[PDB]
Amino acid sequence: SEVGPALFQSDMTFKIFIDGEVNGQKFTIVADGSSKFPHGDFNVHAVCETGKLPMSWKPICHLIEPFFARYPDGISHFAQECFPEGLSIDRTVRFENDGTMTSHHTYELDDTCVVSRITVNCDGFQPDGPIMRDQLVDILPSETHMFPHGPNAVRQTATIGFTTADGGKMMGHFDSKMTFNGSRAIEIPGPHFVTIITKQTRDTSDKRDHVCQREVAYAHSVPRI
């Protein structure tokens, strides 16, 4: 039937609303992108409505689409299977020697546009560290570990990584859970890995604070790192 991956057989779009704060400084972001079939290599553009973003955009990368990873046959694409009802995410990213980002996401489908609403609290960030001083340069590739969790959720663990301006790295520990919002039975995956390659750049057009980002994301059974 017309559920789950059947709703991902065409080109699609996505839209993201983020309500956040960092060290008590409120910010608001909106973002829009597309994912062309067969998925796995998708782009987004994001803008801060509140003015200048008060922290690096790099740690926002994972807030601005698991359902647009490319999955092989043989591994359940849980995130796609969650549609049309959608899914919620609860996620904590803990930056080494720095602060912690805790987010709650909801995802719904409208026609071919997956819309997410996200709240995020970014607490304990170091004022002289490379997040608050905007010193993160590149986003490293990550191999995340996905595993089923209970009857209707999948968890993942990873380390997320950023290079810094003077040749160092900033790593965070990433824990996230996706929960199906419906009640019908959907296929839970076996444990597996997803390779995530991210490239974020500043958009220097005009005056406003905006970025472009691309993500290549693909699943596989055995780790490559």
Numbering used by the authors: 1 to 64, 68 to 228
Pull verbatim passages from the article behind this deposition.
Here, we presented the X-ray structures of dimeric KillerOrange and monomeric mKillerOrange, the only known to date GFP-photosensitizers with Trp-based chromophore.
Similar to parental SuperNova, destabilization of central hydrophobic patch in the dimeric KillerOrange by Leu160Thr and Phe162Thr replacements ensures a monomeric state of mKillerOrange. The side chain of Trp66 of the chromophore in KillerOrange and mKillerOrange adopts an unusual trans-cis conformation, not seen for other Trp-based chromophores before. A higher resolution structure of mKillerOrange also shows the traces (~10–15%) of alternative cis-cis conformation with χ1/χ2 of -5°/-8°. In both structures, the indole ring of Trp66 in a dominant trans-cis conformation is stabilized by hydrogen bond between the indole nitrogen and the side chain of Gln159 and shows a noticeable deviation from the chromophore planarity (χ2 ~16–26°). Similar to their red progenitors, KillerOrange and mKillerOrange, show the presence of a water-filled channel extending along the β-barrel axis.
